[PDB]
Design an enzyme around this catalytic site. Structure first.
Site, PDB file in Angstrom:
ATOM      1  CG  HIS A 101     -20.919 -52.717  82.212  1.00 16.44           C
ATOM      2  ND1 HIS A 101     -20.728 -51.463  82.756  1.00 16.44           N
ATOM      3  CD2 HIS A 101     -21.900 -53.297  82.947  1.00 16.44           C
ATOM      4  CE1 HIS A 101     -21.557 -51.292  83.769  1.00 16.44           C
ATOM      5  NE2 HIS A 101     -22.273 -52.394  83.912  1.00 16.44           N
ATOM      6  CG  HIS A 146     -25.810 -56.566  83.871  1.00 17.17           C
ATOM      7  ND1 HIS A 146     -26.155 -56.525  85.199  1.00 17.17           N
ATOM      8  CD2 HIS A 146     -25.250 -55.365  83.587  1.00 17.17           C
ATOM      9  CE1 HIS A 146     -25.837 -55.349  85.703  1.00 17.17           C
ATOM     10  NE2 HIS A 146     -25.292 -54.620  84.745  1.00 17.17           N
ATOM     11  CE  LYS A 193     -20.471 -52.929  88.934  1.00 18.81           C
ATOM     12  NZ  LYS A 193     -21.496 -53.427  88.012  1.00 18.81           N
ATOM     13  CG  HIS A 243     -23.784 -52.659  91.597  1.00 25.52           C
ATOM     14  ND1 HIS A 243     -24.920 -52.006  92.019  1.00 25.52           N
ATOM     15  CD2 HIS A 243     -23.831 -52.659  90.245  1.00 25.52           C
ATOM     16  CE1 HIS A 243     -25.626 -51.628  90.970  1.00 25.52           C
ATOM     17  NE2 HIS A 243     -24.991 -52.018  89.876  1.00 25.52           N
ATOM     18  CG  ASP A 302     -28.216 -51.752  93.090  1.00 25.22           C
ATOM     19  OD1 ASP A 302     -28.012 -50.533  93.284  1.00 25.22           O
ATOM     20  OD2 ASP A 302     -28.908 -52.165  92.133  1.00 25.22           O
ATOM     21  CG  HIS A 343     -22.807 -48.832  90.203  1.00 27.15           C
ATOM     22  ND1 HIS A 343     -23.864 -49.195  89.390  1.00 27.15           N
ATOM     23  CD2 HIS A 343     -23.280 -47.849  91.008  1.00 27.15           C
ATOM     24  CE1 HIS A 343     -24.925 -48.463  89.695  1.00 27.15           C
ATOM     25  NE2 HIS A 343     -24.595 -47.643  90.674  1.00 27.15           N
ATOM     26  CG  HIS A 354     -22.045 -46.719  84.858  1.00 24.79           C
ATOM     27  ND1 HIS A 354     -21.832 -46.116  86.078  1.00 24.79           N
ATOM     28  CD2 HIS A 354     -22.412 -47.997  85.132  1.00 24.79           C
ATOM     29  CE1 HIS A 354     -22.030 -46.989  87.042  1.00 24.79           C
ATOM     30  NE2 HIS A 354     -22.376 -48.143  86.498  1.00 24.79           N
ATOM     31  CG  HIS A 403     -30.597 -49.582  89.376  1.00 22.47           C
ATOM     32  ND1 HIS A 403     -29.438 -50.317  89.494  1.00 22.47           N
ATOM     33  CD2 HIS A 403     -30.365 -48.679  88.387  1.00 22.47           C
ATOM     34  CE1 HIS A 403     -28.546 -49.884  88.623  1.00 22.47           C
ATOM     35  NE2 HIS A 403     -29.087 -48.888  87.939  1.00 22.47           N
ATOM     36  NE  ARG A 409     -28.418 -44.035  88.379  1.00 21.76           N
ATOM     37  CZ  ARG A 409     -28.408 -45.358  88.503  1.00 21.76           C
ATOM     38  NH1 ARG A 409     -28.699 -45.925  89.667  1.00 21.76           N
ATOM     39  NH2 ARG A 409     -28.193 -46.125  87.448  1.00 21.76           N
ATOM     40  CG  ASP A 437     -24.997 -51.173  82.360  1.00 23.29           C
ATOM     41  OD1 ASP A 437     -25.112 -52.239  82.993  1.00 23.29           O
ATOM     42  OD2 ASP A 437     -25.205 -50.063  82.896  1.00 23.29           O
TER      43      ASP A 437
HETATM   44 NI    NI Z   1     -23.688 -49.871  87.264  1.00 24.32          NI
HETATM   45 NI    NI Z   2     -24.287 -52.743  84.940  1.00 25.61          NI
END
Ligand code: NI
Ligand code: NI
Ligand code: NI
Ligand code: NI
Ligand code: NI
Ligand code: NI
Lengths: 100, 101, 566, 566, 566, 100
Positions: free
Chosen positions: C133, C135, C216, C218, C220, C245, C271, C319, C335, C359
């Protein structure tokens, strides 16, 4: 000592704070980098002492006042964030509007 | 609490079990100290050490791996030897065997 | 002759029946087996055993190993044993008894003129960690992770850009190609994840054909049923993994809708507890399914007194949320739940959650995956006692269950277990040597592909390597061409066949991913539990078979203030 | 629906009519245009606009951009506008409205699965700076300049050698080849200058054929009429630029003799004010000619209270002069004149001087080209008020005039404007993102060829990228092969044809210079004034059309003590 | 006209008859010759001599040098002279008089447009040092050594592994190949040593065929007569050198047995005094033989008040010895003898010991080879006065004898003198420029293959390169491809023929070793003495021709506290 | 100043020691890295003062006691080693069991 990259990075923050500390002591109005370093280093020591994240989020707003820094500086710092090893591991302290 | 501490169970470890051994009286006739390692072919040690080299053939010191026995000049002492295993081939040292045995 | 057990341990490390404390935790491991022949242990140094004709033989390079780790205490998912480890051609050759067959018995790892020696007596050796995980916000993350003991990093990103700050995605062929080229400069094994959020299959196939080993999905970028179905369809045909996610906002449906969209297809849920993202408040219920490989990110591990307090602002920045926008702060709050955070530690102890990850810099700490995994084990032993599977007076089973979380399980989940993930013959020699007092915190040596890549190093001008200041510095395995030879860039089968490595002129060794579609929960080593878990919509209480799952927050943790300068 | 202007600015950045203060100066810019459709702005983040089927479409990589900078406030020589910027294949694709054509109107920049996002709302975006007066004294200069916002560096040198300490010259084929090879390691675009001081044409042609994009004529190597004529003759035939540092000593003639030797041919005059070198005391009169492209080096910019005092010893060290040798100190003094230093700031404000540069570590500061240019603008606004060209209640025109000095004008002067120098479609994507409070001082992101190369980065092990300490660190665009793909090594047309790149095995992208002979003063954007300027031989007073040109020295400057730790 | 000698020295450096103090020692050197023509010296700078038509000519690159070091005071084994040094194609072109033949007399080094200039007036220039006892424990050692003035490093290792911690061995083909590849990343010339401890010839031939230029016989791997004979046999057939660390324990025989095993064949004996390893207590008697090339490692140099005290624990860590094991501490003690340590300094002064080396991080300091060599010279002058060979009132001969110890002699011993080791035409341009006040301590410039590789550098953003803080930073010669072109990787003749460079894809220039078997004690420049030396078995007293050899320990040394911050 | 790599490396040790010094002053029980840095920096200054290696090997065992450091720390430091420029050049000081 077996210092990891992150421990060595924090030594840079500590040293930057020593610079600001001496200047504040001379009676100078701190600038942008000096203010950020001073408040940040304060929080790191708080964590070493065993203070909680909640307590530091508050205490951090009382390290410097608007009259101890140059004009415009308070507005250049909407918040300060720093992490340190608390008794319960690494935690993030976010101090909103530290200078008032 | 001691970080990474051992909790070794009491007792002893028997070394090189089930292998032929022999005792030999050795005497350092040289004027300088001589120290021999646990896995050195005893029959080919420094020529100044006087003993029955013939009896020590294919043997090494019966001591824990990595340790040694020191002989100061003029020192005489009895040591215990343990026979080599594996292929029982000796190569190196003073180049006296360079082959099986 | 005879030697006392204590003196023996001081010279060659512990043996069968001896116990060792892991760092400053309450976890103790007991040596289960010792592959040596007492009296024939190999030791290197002045006047020691590894010398010509003695512990070292006359064989050519082809008949002996390139490197031997002597008297190592191995801790892996399959056992906690004492043995010598042989490495040849950058790979694990054998785990057994090293020496010279000419004069020693039971030698399975021949030492010759071509053999280098690493003294592991009194040290614990483990496989390198695998963080799935990542980034890619900055390249500095690789050194931080390597120093912590993590040798493989799977994730996505293009640098400090908004998209990468929030998601593990390397968007499209151009950026993918660029990051594959940049990867040659980093001392860790790397695999990239593309942006899987699209309802047009070809847009995904292009990314896979360009080099990504996974996609991935996600929120977002829109975690809708359509996007999820599209990504899984492509994954099923190209043998790559999908990381999820989910839709925290429940905008397109609730957790049951997402699960239905997944339709029993293999998927890695990031997660799974939810704080890092996912259907509020029940994304955690996913760990009940056979096709779900569930992991945790590290900030919530383990539940401590300061955990909740630090999460809100961390959530916002990660985010791009506006604290002045009420809806933005309301969804951040939904969350963070004490109830699911407390339950997560127990679910790990039970084997319901199978992986730990970071993460990195997006609600996670890159250098704390290993450290936090062990803190959870400690807190669980302290609270719940011995696991039902324990045998003997030690924590061996709990140790095997937890180590699997950042080694073999992530490797299996992502289709790279044929190359890395454990200390088994034929796998890349990515090993980490630890002193028991610093286990999981600060390694003594990190080996990549058979070469030391980073290690603590004292004064460069000193007479010995030990004088202060001692801090981590890059070694030969992290240098230029030697690095290329000791690291792997993982590619999808399609990219490998398309000649992507030749086209981009990648210098490092290439490995291909496979088996991403066939892994299921039952395959996770020591962590295959599928509990009948439920989350109360109003109270957020987590229950398994009706019983409430929970734990207490720690005020102080091991592997913390005793080791770090800051 | 409806939204207030303030709330709008807080979410998407300012719009038409809103003004923004540049750092802590007195300069204000007003948004002239906004290319968006109100209500259709793209925003990335949790539950935002850029998501599958919404702000992100279904197109393949070929039909969408690789990177989009959303809601950027562009400041360039052509306008100060609000728009989205699309980057594709490392180049500027379009300036317009980004999004998904499927559901949004007026989309000119399509966002798809292959698109990365950089959030520029509330930020100012500019082209990367171009410093054409670099002394390659040390490689560390490239990082210093990149961090300041300068992405292209043209100059000469071989390292810390006496010749390079004093002049911007990379002498001969061997050193030129060596520096071209070393350039691949640096994260900035690079072009080299050879030693133009010779009266034998072939000795110059060899250097151009070896790779230099220009020739430096320096007095330390003999700035005689013969050498000048020789260099210009070769420049005229090989389409390369000549940079001049004239005969301060008036040894071979006065300024009129040099001008006559130049004979109306194109030439770039370095530090035209004189302190950095040139006919004493009237080298400044060169800015009156049509064939002269005049620039300033930065230590004299702007005229402050401490300027004069620091110049003498700086002069000595830079030129290997002996303070004990009377003639050496007398000629150092004749270069430092309060009269010409004060006039220089005004000449920049009027557009008589067209470029700013550093003169790195040889009477100049490499990280202060941009910063000082803006300090001059501030001091000029404060002293002279609005420019005759200003329209509206803002400093937009003065801002466009000054930004051109370190972007498009240097690019035009050196024949590289076809590749870099401004934010226009088809040019290399070298962009700099700034927060208004730090404009011209400390950038938020520096992009090279479509990839972020350097940016401020906080704690690597932190849960987010923002925690302290935050300082500039190299990103993926500055790493190995990704770097090679994102930077340019400029060559002369002759070198390109000769296969120099293949012979030296240069890894970076190659660009060729052209149009160095045809540029004239009239081509300098917003800085084409040719004043009837005179310098009094005795008093050193500068006059234009008989009127005295002068200004007052600053005691305090913006972009100074409020931002720097030292 | 006429000029006073003092004023002359201030402008061009000292001339014939002038003396200069070496740092803060008591050693003075007198200029023996000056190759210039008074009035025609070349000087660079504003209005100086090196300008078009003046000190610079009209020749093409092929007819002039690429670099000239003006007015240098050369200190080498062959003389201490004042001259200009010309460098062309990365090699020493000539030592003579530089300038323009068109107007100047006696020009042997033509300066043209293609010539860079380094001002050496007032500076001492020497060849780069050569350390032949490197333990490749970490890559950081190369920068430390380069900064000290050492440009070539010969040794062995694979990183911080037990084998390398104790011995200078790169075991086998795999590790050898890996280290040859890693060497391209380091800014120094490199040659590797393999593990010579084996009684099977083929195991040695493989290593030589893989790339090593020598074989290290070390007692930790078994320094038995059989192993020694085997290594020497292979060395004799492959023209490579053997370095020896004998059997301290006298386990296989005494020093006379080892000498007999060597059988008159050429061999380099490491740390011949014994503290670093070797037959106790008489390994020092080896310096009496014609086939032995003897060197010292640096911690015992020179004998000081704290020398003995620091050696015990240093010994233990370097050889993995256990202080609790009586036999381990007894053999550590037998290596540390005040008697042999005191004698060693005198033997160097007499020329019985021919080389100095470090023994980096394994009982030696990598950045102190040069510094300690000069401290020994100082202490010997102070104690013993002038050498029998001295002529005039200066220490010129003692200076030539000592400089040979870390330059030409190590080069001869290892078969690389055809490439490096001294300032002679045709040799690689590895030069070090020093200011007299810092001679042997901190260099002003370190040149590798014709390019500056490292030098002190001040504030990067400053107006000049001199402002604080000034510390050593890598220059262009240490960057990527320029580095590859300026360094050498030495290979054995067999490896070169086998195409090892092509197979491993080595990027740097390749050099082959030769003449390792034919060098003998008589060939060591100024250090060919073979004394009738004896060591008393009981008292350890060293005697030559019956006379006792000894010296007194220093309480304070030059080149120490006056220069270092720590 | 012309600082070599080794001089700059020691500045890291000095700074790490400043951190520990301030914490010891506040009355905190030092941790592993803090203890190593404090004792190390002490020895470096000793060498600058001109003390002998023998004297420092002894004095170094009296900088911190078991009651001034966290539990387990004394056992994590079986010895401390540091080099510094003594009047007679660089020497290595090894302090066995510094904390008791
Ligand atoms: Ni995530
Ligand atoms: Ni992440
Ligand atoms: Ni100039
Ligand atoms: Ni200049
Ligand atoms: Ni040795
Ligand atoms: Ni050695």
């Amino acid at each position: 000592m077996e210092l990891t990259p992150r421990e060595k990075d924090k030594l840079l923050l500590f040293t930057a704070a020593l610079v600001a500390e001496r200047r504040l002591a001379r009676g100078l109005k701190l600038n942008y980098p000096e203010s950020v370093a001073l408040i940040s280093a304060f929080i790191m020591e708080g964590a070493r002492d065993g203070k909680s994240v909640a307590s530091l989020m508050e205490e951090g707003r009382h390290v410097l006042t608007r009259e101890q820094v140059m004009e415009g500086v308070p507005e250049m710092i909407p918040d300060i964030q720093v992490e340190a090893t608390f008794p319960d591991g690494s935690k993030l302290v976010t101090v909103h509007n530290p200078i008032i | 609490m001691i970080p990474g501490e051992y909790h070794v169970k009491p007792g002893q470890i028997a070394l090189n079990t089930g292998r032929a051994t022999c005792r030999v009286v050795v005497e350092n006739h040289g004027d300088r100290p001589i120290q021999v390692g646990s896995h050195y072919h005893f029959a080919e040690v420094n020529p100044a050490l006087k003993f029955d080299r013939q009896q020590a053939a294919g043997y090494r010191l019966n001591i824990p791996a990595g340790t040694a026995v020191r002989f100061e000049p003029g020192q005489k002492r009895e040591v215990e030897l343990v026979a080599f295993a594996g292929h029982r081939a000796v190569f190196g040292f003073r180049g006296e065997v360079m082959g099986p045995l | 002759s005879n030697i006392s057990r204590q003196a023996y341990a001081d010279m060659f490390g512990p043996t069968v029946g001896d116990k060792v404390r892991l760092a400053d935790t309450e976890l103790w491991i007991e040596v289960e087996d010792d592959l040596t022949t007492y009296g024939e242990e190999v030791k290197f140094g002045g006047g020691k055993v590894i010398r010509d004709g003695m512990g070292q033989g006359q064989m050519l390079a082809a008949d002996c190993v390139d490197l031997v780790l002597t008297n190592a205490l191995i801790v892996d998912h399959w056992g906690i044993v004492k043995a010598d480890i042989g490495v040849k051609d950058g790979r694990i050759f054998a785990i057994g008894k090293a020496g010279n067959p000419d004069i020693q018995p039971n030698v399975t790892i021949p030492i010759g003129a071509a053999t280098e020696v690493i003294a592991a007596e009194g040290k614990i050796v483990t496989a390198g960690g695998i963080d799935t995980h990542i980034h890619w916000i900055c390249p500095q993350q690789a050194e931080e992770a390597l120093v912590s003991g993590v040798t493989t990093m799977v994730g996505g990103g293009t640098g400090p850009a908004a998209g990468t700050h929030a998601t593990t995605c390397t968007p499209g062929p151009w950026y993918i190609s660029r990051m594959l080229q940049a990867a040659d400069s980093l001392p860790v094994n790397i695999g990239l994840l593309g942006k899987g959020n699209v309802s047009q299959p070809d847009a995904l196939r292009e990314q896979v054909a360009a080099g990504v080993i996974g996609l991935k999905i996600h929120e977002d970028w829109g975690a809708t049923p359509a996007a999820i179905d599209c990504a899984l369809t492509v994954a099923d045909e190209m043998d790559i993994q999908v990381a999820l996610h989910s839709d925290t906002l429940n905008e397109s449906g609730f957790v049951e809708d997402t699960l239905a969209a997944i339709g029993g297809r293999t998927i890695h849920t990031f997660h799974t507890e939810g704080a890092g993202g996912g259907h509020a408040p029940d994304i955690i219920t996913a760990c009940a399914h056979p096709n779900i490989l569930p992991s945790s990110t590290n900030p919530t591990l383990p539940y401590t007194l300061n955990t909740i307090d630090e999460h809100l602002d961390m959530l916002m920045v990660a985010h791009h949320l506006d604290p002045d926008i009420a809806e933005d702060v309301a969804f951040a709050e939904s969350r963070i739940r004490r109830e699911t955070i407390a339950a997560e530690d127990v679910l790990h102890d039970l084997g319901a959650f199978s992986l730990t990850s970071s993460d990195s810099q997006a609600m996670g700490r890159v250098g704390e995956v290993i450290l936090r995994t062990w803190q959870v084990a400690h807190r669980m032993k302290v609270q719940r006692g011995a696991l039902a599977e324990e045998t003997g007076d030690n924590d061996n089973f709990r140790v095997k269950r937890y180590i699997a979380k950042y080694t073999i399980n992530p490797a299996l989940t992502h289709g790279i277990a044929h190359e890395v993930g454990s200390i088994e013959v034929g796998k890349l020699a990515d090993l980490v040597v630890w002193s028991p007092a610093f286990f999981g915190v600060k390694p003594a040596t990190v080996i990549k592909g058979g070469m030391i890549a980073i290690a603590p190093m004292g004064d460069i001008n000193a007479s010995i390597p030990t004088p202060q200041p001692v801090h981590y510095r890059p070694m030969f395995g992290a240098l230029g061409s030697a690095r290329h030879h000791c690291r792997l860039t993982f590619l999808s089968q399609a990219a490998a066949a398309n000649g992507v490595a030749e086209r981009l002129n990648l210098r490092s060794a290439i490995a291909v991913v496979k088996g991403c579609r066939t892994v299921q929960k039952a395959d996770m080593v020591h962590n295959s539990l599928q509990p009948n878990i439920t989350v109360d919509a109003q109270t957020y209480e987590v229950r398994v078979d009706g019983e409430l799952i929970t734990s207490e927050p720690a005020d102080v943790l091991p592997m913390a203030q005793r080791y770090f300068l800051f």
